Scaffold this active site. Structure first.
Site, PDB file in Angstrom:
ATOM      1  N   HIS A   1     -60.612  -0.130 -28.831  1.00  0.00           N
ATOM      2  CA  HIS A   1     -59.347  -0.683 -28.331  1.00  0.00           C
ATOM      3  C   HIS A   1     -59.356  -0.435 -26.837  1.00  0.00           C
ATOM      4  CE1 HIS A   1     -55.032  -1.491 -28.087  1.00  0.00           C
ATOM      5  NE2 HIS A   1     -55.003  -1.693 -29.392  1.00  0.00           N
TER       6      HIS A   1
ATOM      7  N   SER B   1     -60.077  -3.749  -6.247  1.00  0.00           N
ATOM      8  CA  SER B   1     -58.785  -4.434  -6.442  1.00  0.00           C
ATOM      9  C   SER B   1     -58.310  -4.416  -7.876  1.00  0.00           C
ATOM     10  CB  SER B   1     -58.899  -5.894  -6.036  1.00  0.00           C
ATOM     11  OG  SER B   1     -57.624  -6.506  -6.175  1.00  0.00           O
TER      12      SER B   1
ATOM     13  N   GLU C   1     -59.820  14.625 -44.736  1.00  0.00           N
ATOM     14  CA  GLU C   1     -59.258  14.374 -43.401  1.00  0.00           C
ATOM     15  C   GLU C   1     -59.548  15.610 -42.541  1.00  0.00           C
ATOM     16  OE1 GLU C   1     -56.803  16.123 -41.745  1.00  0.00           O
ATOM     17  OE2 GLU C   1     -56.266  14.700 -40.127  1.00  0.00           O
TER      18      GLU C   1
ATOM     19  N   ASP D   1     -50.185 -15.133 -38.427  1.00  0.00           N
ATOM     20  CA  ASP D   1     -51.567 -14.745 -38.013  1.00  0.00           C
ATOM     21  C   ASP D   1     -51.667 -14.431 -36.533  1.00  0.00           C
ATOM     22  OD1 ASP D   1     -52.411 -15.103 -40.664  1.00  0.00           O
ATOM     23  OD2 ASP D   1     -53.634 -16.901 -40.199  1.00  0.00           O
TER      24      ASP D   1
HETATM   25  O1  LIG Z   1     -60.975  15.832 -37.166  1.00  0.00           O
HETATM   26  C1  LIG Z   1     -59.924  15.326 -36.706  1.00  0.00           C
HETATM   27  O2  LIG Z   1     -59.888  14.322 -35.931  1.00  0.00           O
HETATM   28  C2  LIG Z   1     -58.580  15.974 -37.030  1.00  0.00           C
HETATM   29  C3  LIG Z   1     -58.568  16.882 -38.286  1.00  0.00           C
HETATM   30  C4  LIG Z   1     -57.260  17.719 -38.409  1.00  0.00           C
HETATM   31  N1  LIG Z   1     -56.088  16.923 -38.080  1.00  0.00           N
HETATM   32  C5  LIG Z   1     -54.894  17.557 -37.928  1.00  0.00           C
HETATM   33  O3  LIG Z   1     -54.818  18.742 -38.297  1.00  0.00           O
HETATM   34  N2  LIG Z   1     -53.913  16.810 -37.418  1.00  0.00           N
HETATM   35  C6  LIG Z   1     -52.570  17.364 -37.240  1.00  0.00           C
HETATM   36  C7  LIG Z   1     -52.674  17.955 -35.811  1.00  0.00           C
HETATM   37  C8  LIG Z   1     -51.322  18.081 -35.140  1.00  0.00           C
HETATM   38  C9  LIG Z   1     -50.286  18.757 -35.752  1.00  0.00           C
HETATM   39  C10 LIG Z   1     -49.026  18.846 -35.134  1.00  0.00           C
HETATM   40  C11 LIG Z   1     -48.847  18.269 -33.883  1.00  0.00           C
HETATM   41  O4  LIG Z   1     -47.603  18.353 -33.293  1.00  0.00           O
HETATM   42  C12 LIG Z   1     -49.901  17.596 -33.235  1.00  0.00           C
HETATM   43  I1  LIG Z   1     -49.697  16.693 -31.315  1.00  0.00           I
HETATM   44  C13 LIG Z   1     -51.137  17.510 -33.883  1.00  0.00           C
HETATM   45  C14 LIG Z   1     -51.570  16.242 -37.321  1.00  0.00           C
HETATM   46  O5  LIG Z   1     -51.891  15.159 -36.769  1.00  0.00           O
HETATM   47  O6  LIG Z   1     -50.542  16.424 -38.004  1.00  0.00           O
HETATM   48  C15 LIG Z   1     -57.362  18.684 -37.210  1.00  0.00           C
HETATM   49  O7  LIG Z   1     -56.758  18.509 -36.091  1.00  0.00           O
HETATM   50  O8  LIG Z   1     -58.033  19.758 -37.351  1.00  0.00           O
HETATM   51 ZN   LIG Z   2     -53.216  16.855 -42.075  1.00  0.00          ZN
HETATM   52 ZN   LIG Z   3     -54.668  19.488 -40.768  1.00  0.00          ZN
END
Ligand SMILES: O=C(O)CC[C@H](NC(=O)N[C@@H](Cc1ccc(O)c(I)c1)C(=O)O)C(=O)O
Ligand SMILES: [Zn+2]
Ligand SMILES: [Zn+2]
Ligand SMILES: *[C@@H]1O[C@H](CO)[C@@H](O[C@@H]2O[C@H](CO)[C@@H](O[C@@H]3O[C@H](CO)[C@@H](O)[C@H](O[C@H]4O[C@H](CO)[C@@H](O)[C@H](O)[C@@H]4O)[C@@H]3O)[C@H](O)[C@H]2NC(C)=O)[C@H](O)[C@H]1NC(C)=O
Ligand SMILES: *[C@@H]1O[C@H](CO)[C@@H](O[C@@H]2O[C@H](CO)[C@@H](O[C@@H]3O[C@H](CO)[C@@H](O)[C@H](O[C@H]4O[C@H](CO)[C@@H](O)[C@H](O)[C@@H]4O)[C@@H]3O)[C@H](O)[C@H]2NC(C)=O)[C@H](O)[C@H]1NC(C)=O
Ligand SMILES: *[C@@H]1O[C@H](CO)[C@@H](O[C@@H]2O[C@H](CO)[C@@H](O[C@@H]3O[C@H](CO)[C@@H](O)[C@H](O)[C@@H]3O)[C@H](O)[C@H]2NC(C)=O)[C@H](O)[C@H]1NC(C)=O
Ligand SMILES: *[C@@H]1O[C@H](CO)[C@@H](O[C@@H]2O[C@H](CO)[C@@H](O[C@@H]3O[C@H](CO)[C@@H](O)[C@H](O)[C@@H]3O)[C@H](O)[C@H]2NC(C)=O)[C@H](O)[C@H]1NC(C)=O
Ligand SMILES: *[C@@H]1O[C@H](CO)[C@@H](O[C@@H]2O[C@H](CO)[C@@H](O)[C@H](O)[C@H]2NC(C)=O)[C@H](O)[C@H]1NC(C)=O
Ligand SMILES: *[C@@H]1O[C@H](CO)[C@@H](O[C@@H]2O[C@H](CO)[C@@H](O)[C@H](O)[C@H]2NC(C)=O)[C@H](O)[C@H]1NC(C)=O
Ligand SMILES: *[C@@H]1O[C@H](CO)[C@@H](O[C@@H]2O[C@H](CO)[C@@H](O)[C@H](O)[C@H]2NC(C)=O)[C@H](O)[C@H]1NC(C)=O
Ligand SMILES: *[C@@H]1O[C@H](CO)[C@@H](O[C@@H]2O[C@H](CO)[C@@H](O)[C@H](O)[C@H]2NC(C)=O)[C@H](O)[C@H]1NC(C)=O
Ligand SMILES: O=C(O)CC[C@H](NC(=O)N[C@@H](Cc1ccc(O)c(I)c1)C(=O)O)C(=O)O
Ligand SMILES: *[C@@H]1O[C@H](CO)[C@@H](O)[C@H](O)[C@H]1NC(C)=O
Ligand SMILES: *[C@@H]1O[C@H](CO)[C@@H](O)[C@H](O)[C@H]1NC(C)=O
Ligand SMILES: *[C@@H]1O[C@H](CO)[C@@H](O)[C@H](O)[C@H]1NC(C)=O
Ligand SMILES: *[C@@H]1O[C@H](CO)[C@@H](O)[C@H](O)[C@H]1NC(C)=O
Ligand SMILES: *[C@@H]1O[C@H](CO)[C@@H](O)[C@H](O)[C@H]1NC(C)=O
Ligand SMILES: *[C@@H]1O[C@H](CO)[C@@H](O)[C@H](O)[C@H]1NC(C)=O
Ligand SMILES: [Ca+2]
Ligand SMILES: [Ca+2]
Ligand SMILES: [Cl-]
Ligand SMILES: [Cl-]
Ligand SMILES: [Zn+2]
Ligand SMILES: [Zn+2]
Lengths: 691, 691
Positions: A630, A571, A370, A607
């Site tokens: 989305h 619009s 991740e 569904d």
């Molecule tokens: O590559 C990616 O999309 C994300 C990989 C990694 N993801 C990550 O660390 N996410 C964390 C980032 C985060 C932490 C605390 C927060 O309050 C927030 I808003 C975002 C999370 O979602 O908990 C990063 O941000 O470096």
């Molecule tokens: Zn994480």
């Molecule tokens: Zn992280």
């Protein structure tokens, strides 16, 4: 009885504590042996806990690592090319871990190699608006300069993209105490603040949902065809490296050129925060030199996927997923989440061993990589997209369970608002002062909805976590929940540093593991209701309410340009018409859902409920972001962490007054209005009577 | 009883005859008042016949029409600019129609305007291989020449694309008696052959599945944003016009330059078939001049959509659709098909009035603007894509019911092979000599399968009809059937001419309407079984058999280049592995389907059957053809009418030995092998146990 209460009562704070300790003794960096061993441990345990099947799904994806024998660092260099100051080669390890091996030193994952030398420009948080201020208002040119930027406010990959487009030749990221040191709390090991030697790791890609850079659209399996590096998705073109505030002070203290334009550009270090370019007179001939030698390497990763087969609707999947890989020990990120998942699996497995099965199938996932761009979740979803498209009910994420100890934080699709309100009214608040009160009550008091009295705040989903592929690419209703800080008094300071340890959590965040337990109750309770409720617990009328709010919001943005809306006949009538129709049809659908013994009418109706989030997907994707499909929600183009509503129209309007050809620009706004109105109407129509 | 026999026995040849007569007295050109009146007539009648609801769905799409006061024609022009010969301004009308108004004169729909003057080059059928022969072998350069090409062999839009890419400045299409005059039969009104004044109308777009040129991806509704003409999809860049063989003889008789390279380039006119460029010595200074003044105009079209709601599974749609718009009277194309649909609706409605309802919902469609690029079916499917994606069981097309009187022709997905074999064994043959024998028996005898003894030929679906959006874009199992000619003794000669009338059909093709009745039985019987069978009547094992045939075929094409497969390590192992897996899994699924009172297991299994064609869809589409998304089947890139199997790999291999960068070319072949193997494996996996 085997009901939600049975499930919830089985969850134990003491077990979450034991699992957290177990998962945080050694680093579990993606692609390393230690993380493969932990994958095998979780696979074995989930089997023992009673899941029907537990498999490893592996992929070979692009990862990035420093060179162990050629360390990354930054210098101040004089006229002769003498390096008179060097940044640190590692973070001082915390007490009792000074002999742990394999702690990856701070680096920016996926940086290219290089040794650029140049004059510094300070760009604040390196946001879109920071570069606008620099270039447009201050007339400072970043071209061929090394930019220094403070972490904070937006995803670091957006900072690097913005620096690249400004023509920078390198980027230095640092943690300012303004953003990572809470007044009145001590540095780690004595408190939860970032010390001056602490440094935030993190990748700097701009993948826009693609997953592995070399295989966009398809899983990175054994026979996969890979793009060459030159055509890879999302890689930065300039070197990048993160540093702590002791080192930053040394690079910033000599800065000359222009003063900071205002106080929003000043952090808390004892330096002027001059924007430069370059240093003051005495030092005007010294330069900054980066030395980056990290390498990108295709490397095997492992997801653990557990299945608890449904008793009645086995071909309907409710998914609880979070990642297992960490930058170092992962005391909060991700293991505080992974321990909660582990205890949820254990609780479900206890019920199962007594003869219970959920109505629908529940899938449990321990994702890998991740931290390197949501690679494990994305490659798995690419492999299984057809199954998920047609069978996926919902995805509940489970990364960090805590980022504070103040109140609950939930971000989710509107379809789950009612489920969340109802579940939290049944759970006990863990908060001091709210003994014997519901979580709904404590949460609503501490985090009031900005629109509604007597209701709690629930935010839109952004991105930067493993729900991205499920929600924004595939259109599966998704949600996340954790305990958070008071965003009024003050992410969390030790984020992605070596100091994020079991001791951080046990001493400073959650010594009793009661907030972890509360989060296990919210996540697990949501999974329980989604997998067991006869009628899916989605309320389409809650989407109708928010679509009207987002329509008002985007119309208000456009109305800052009344002359152009007149000239180009812009619009919003069709979008408000569609939202009105959606509201009318959803109201009628809701009556039938309550007014309808017929399992076919039920499942027909189930569904319609499951495919309603699916209906907001446009198979052509958003402009230049084919994996964000989305139409109502995408990650902000300026900040991956933040959600944007009506993103196609938002980006068409953004900075439109600067576009050289207004006719073309406003035509594209009109096109995005048409696409949004059409998609909202088409989604409404999936809720009409089917024939 | 209300069973298939009740349905089939209600169909009457006499009724199909009456409806055919009723639908062919006046022209029903798309976009005209006459065609709107016929739409309203069909809507009223389908209501009377007993459908639950019958609505008009309208769209405003780009159509193309000649200028009534500035006629299109072609000249031979002398040194002075005197027009010494002009092509005809209209086809001589048939007996008794010489006073019919509003017969559109022959033209090529969507031609741009222009008056190019130049030397002719004759390019045979203007196929890819004809231009290869001209340019590569004969060294004739078409750049800035007017090309003359005979109709036949491939869709006319492919001819115009190929001429454009050869640098032609205009294209003249004509009907050669070699291809449109069967030996021993007289010209219309005395037989079914094309007279020398007859001319084939038809559009010349290259839409690749886009539908309305101005709104690709979205329905052309009231608020739609339209592309400008310059960015429209599929429009030709050079003028084009069709002529008959009396006129062609005048343009060809003077041709000079090079002789025809061989006899496959010679038609049946008394001319040399010289390729030129230009005329023989005496006439060397005469030129050919086109005068094209047609206009493209956004115009309203109307689909009729009838619904017979299902008794048990109303949210499962079986669709019987064909078009209503014609070039002129539409005696065969489309009204021979539309009359059959009309009688099918009447028969279903008779059962309904007696209290019967099908298990699933049946949708009946009278599409508009098929002749201008499948516009009505495509815009409707764009509007309703989410409903069709998640609910569409199958699509049965119903254009021309007859193109001959010899035997049956079926083109369909492998999933319907078994249904077709079984249904035709239960139907009576209408053929002379097969009195009291089944249709299966007559068909198999006259059209034997090239692979299997004792089985009939069933072809892959190509395109050039209204099933394209349902099959190749959306992945809904589709099929078509009609009576056809003996492709051994000899399309049909009067195709898209003014001579395609009720009298053509009644006198020469089907005086007793017995072949029409047989086709109503095949189409209606298929709809009946699809909409009523408890288990969907699809056999996934038939796909496994054909996937192996197509894998062998594409591997054989690649193996013409063994040195390159060695050099670039081009392996088909993953594709054969996937096909083997699909075969194993489909065999197991079939056992469960036969071995499984449980409506949830059934519908689970019905959904696995319905979503199996869906699984072959790649949401990224094929290279540069985003609306052709099926990985197993696409219309041939050289001939829209023909289906191609493994089209992504096929086009990557096609003419590869001519590519300038073999490493890049063979890398793309490897990429398409990966995509195909992945998609086949992913489709197989939708048939595994669900949890
Ligand atoms: O590559 C990616 O999309 C994300 C990989 C990694 N993801 C990550 O660390 N996410 C964390 C980032 C985060 C932490 C605390 C927060 O309050 C927030 I808003 C975002 C999370 O979602 O908990 C990063 O941000 O470096
Ligand atoms: Zn994480
Ligand atoms: Zn992280
Ligand atoms: C919200 O739902 C409503 C239905 O409750 C839906 O209303 C539909 O609106 C369309 C578009 O405005 C209507 O389209 C009209 O249809 C009639 C025939 O029924 C046509 O004659 C109309 O065309 C004439 O007028 C136009 C405008 O002045 C001209 O541009 C044109 O040249 C014609 O002269 C027009 O196409 C449609 O009838 C209703 N359907 C109903 C009421 O049942 C609305 O579209 C939905 N919102 C969205 C965003 O889909
Ligand atoms: C058809 O279905 C079969 C299953 O019945 C399916 O077989 C799978 O094939 C893959 C790809 O070959 C196998 O992947 C291997 O998995 C093991 C772990 O289980 C890995 O150790 C292997 O990697 C090593 O070896 C590779 C090749 O020598 C090296 O490149 C690599 O560096 C490693 O050293 C390898 O990834 C998988 O185990 C089976 N699954 C089974 C038998 O259950 C096959 O893929 C299907 N066909 C398609 C096209 O999907
Ligand atoms: C969250 O909880 C609320 C409150 O319990 C749930 O709403 C309630 O849901 C029930 C069941 O649909 C509704 O009862 C129905 O009342 C109508 C008469 O108006 C009757 O015809 C039905 O047979 C049934 O008894 C009840 O009205 C409703 N309460 C409200 C909206 O105030 C809600 O469904 C829960 N949300 C979930 C589970 O996602
Ligand atoms: C086309 O018709 C053929 C011949 O009728 C159909 O195949 C037959 O289908 C039936 C029902 O599935 C099969 O009967 C089954 O036999 C097994 C024992 O082997 C038993 O376990 C089941 O309970 C059931 O009786 C029969 O074997 C099979 N005949 C074959 C394949 O030769 C076929 O399904 C039809 N195709 C359609 C409707 O698409
Ligand atoms: C985390 O917990 C696991 C499971 O209790 C421990 O792994 C077990 O270790 C014992 C003793 O070495 C072995 O006999 C078992 O085979 C292991 N079980 C597994 C892997 O499923 C592991 O030692 C713990 N880790 C830490 C750091 O305490
Ligand atoms: C910063 O680090 C660099 C690199 O290690 C140091 O410069 C090196 O010093 C060694 C030993 O004196 C020399 O042999 C190398 O030639 C130097 N390398 C380079 C690239 O300049 C430098 O001394 C360090 N600066 C400080 C203040 O510690
Ligand atoms: C085709 O058949 C239709 C239906 O029988 C005919 O339309 C009817 O004509 C009668 C007499 O003019 C009217 O009273 C009805 O209102 C019409 N019914 C409709 C339109 O549903 C039509 O005349 C026939 N066309 C031809 C050329 O014979
Ligand atoms: C082919 O048609 C053209 C156009 O109608 C004819 O040329 C015209 O003849 C009229 C009357 O003699 C002149 O007034 C126009 O100036 C001519 N127009 C053009 C564009 O040349 C021509 O006579 C016809 N040729 C034949 C053989 O019938
Ligand atoms: O625009 C398009 O894709 C097709 C429009 C129109 N379609 C059409 O006439 N289709 C006819 C073409 C056809 C007729 C007889 C045949 O034996 C064959 I093969 C094709 C049909 O499918 O019956 C056309 O070809 O001009
Ligand atoms: C790491 O640097 C060392 C020492 O200079 C070098 O030998 C090796 O090539 C590098 N390793 C890589 C590029 O992975
Ligand atoms: C910034 O500097 C670069 C490099 O010298 C130059 O090419 C670019 O045009 C400058 N931009 C502006 C807006 O001054
Ligand atoms: C936990 O809560 C207390 C009381 O509000 C607070 O002072 C402390 O800062 C919190 N700990 C963390 C890590 O937020
Ligand atoms: C058709 O040609 C006439 C006569 O020259 C002209 O007046 C009119 O512009 C044309 N109509 C169009 C372009 O639709
Ligand atoms: C064909 O003729 C054109 C126009 O004079 C020229 O530009 C082109 O290169 C020629 N092509 C070949 C292959 O001779
Ligand atoms: C109908 O069948 C007869 C007998 O084979 C044949 O000679 C005639 O050509 C056919 N008519 C048409 C239009 O194909
Ligand atoms: Ca991938
Ligand atoms: Ca369209
Ligand atoms: Cl989370
Ligand atoms: Cl057809
Ligand atoms: Zn037709
Ligand atoms: Zn046609």
């Amino acid at each position: 009885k085997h009901n939600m209460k049975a499930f919830l009562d089985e969850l134990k704070a003491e077990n979450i504590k034991k699992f957290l300790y177990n998962f945080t003794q050694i680093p579990h960096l993606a692609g390393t042996e230690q993380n493969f061993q932990l994958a095998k441990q979780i696979q074995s345990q989930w089997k023992e806990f009673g899941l029907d099947s537990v498999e490893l799904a592996h992929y070979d994806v692009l990862l990035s690592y420093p060179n162990k024998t050629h360390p990354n660092y930054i210098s101040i260099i004089n006229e002769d090319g003498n390096e008179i100051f060097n940044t640190s080669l590692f973070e001082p390890p915390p007490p009792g871990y000074e002999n742990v091996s394999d702690i990856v030193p701070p680096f920016s994952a996926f940086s290219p190699q290089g040794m650029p030398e140049g004059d510094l420009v300070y760009v604040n948080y390196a946001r879109t608006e920071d570069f606008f201020k620099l270039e447009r208002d201050m007339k400072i040119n970043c071209s061929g300069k090394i930019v220094i930027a403070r972490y904070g406010k937006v995803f670091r990959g957006n900072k690097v993209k913005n620096a690249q487009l400004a023509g920078a030749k390198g980027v230095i990221l640092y943690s300012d105490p303004a953003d990572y040191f809470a007044p009145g709390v001590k540095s780690y090991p004595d408190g939860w603040n970032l010390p001056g030697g602490g440094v935030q790791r993190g990748n700097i890609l701009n993948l826009n949902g693609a997953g592995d850079p070399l295989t966009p659209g398809y899983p990175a399996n054994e026979y996969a065809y890979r793009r060459g590096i030159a055509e890879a998705v999302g890689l930065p073109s300039i070197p990048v490296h993160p540093i702590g505030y002791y080192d930053a002070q040394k690079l910033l203290e000599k800065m000359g050129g222009s003063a900071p334009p205002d106080s929003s550009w000043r952090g808390s270090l004892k330096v002027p925060y001059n924007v430069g370019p370059g240093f003051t007179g005495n030092f005007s001939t010294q330069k900054v030199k980066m030395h980056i030698h990290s390498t990108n390497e295709v490397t095997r990763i492992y997801n653990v996927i557990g299945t608890l087969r449904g008793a009645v609707e086995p071909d309907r999947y409710v998914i609880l997923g979070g990642h297992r890989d960490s930058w170092v020990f992962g005391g909060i990120d991700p293991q505080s989440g992974a321990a909660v998942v582990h205890e949820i699996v254990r609780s479900f497995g206890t019920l199962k061993k007594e003869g219970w099965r959920p109505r629908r199938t529940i899938l449990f996932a321990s994702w890998d990589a991740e931290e390197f761009g949501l690679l494990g979740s994305t490659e798995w979803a690419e492999e299984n997209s057809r199954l998920l498209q047609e069978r996926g009910v919902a995805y509940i994420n489970a990364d960090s369970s805590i980022e504070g100890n103040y109140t609950l934080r939930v971000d989710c699709t509107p379809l789950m608002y009612s489920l969340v309100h109802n579940l939290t009214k049944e759970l006990k608040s863990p908060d001091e002062g709210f003994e014997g009160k519901s979580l709904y009550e404590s949460w609503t008091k501490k985090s009031p909805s900005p629109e509604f009295s007597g209701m709690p705040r629930i935010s839109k989903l952004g991105s930067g976590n493993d729900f991205e592929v499920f929600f924004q690419r595939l259109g599966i209703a998704s949600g996340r929940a954790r305990y958070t800080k008071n965003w009024e008094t003050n992410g969390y300071p030790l984020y992605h540093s070596v100091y994020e340890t079991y001791e951080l959590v046990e001493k400073f965040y959650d010594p009793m593991f009661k907030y972890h337990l509360t989060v296990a109750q919210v996540r697990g309770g949501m999974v329980f209701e989604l997998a067991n409720s006869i009628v899916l617990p989605f309320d389409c009328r809650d989407y109708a309410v928010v679509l009207r709010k987002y329509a008002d919001k985007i119309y208000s943005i456009s109305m800052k340009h009344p002359q152009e809306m007149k000239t180009y006949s812009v619009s919003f009538d069709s979008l408000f018409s569609a939202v009105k129709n959606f509201t009318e049809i959803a109201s009628k659908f809701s009556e039938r859902l309550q007014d309808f013994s017929n399992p076919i009418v039920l499942r027909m109706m189930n569904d319609q409920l499951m495919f309603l989030e699916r209906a907001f997907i446009d198979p052509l994707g958003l402009p230049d972001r084919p994996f964000y499909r989305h139409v109502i929600y995408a990650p902000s183009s300026h900040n991956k962490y933040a959600g944007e509503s009506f993103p196609g129209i938002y980006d068409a309007l953004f900075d439109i007054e600067s576009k050289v050809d207004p006719s073309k620009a406003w035509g594209e706004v009109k096109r995005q209005i048409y696409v949004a109105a059409f998609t909202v109407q088409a989604a409404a129509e999936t809720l009409s009577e089917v024939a």
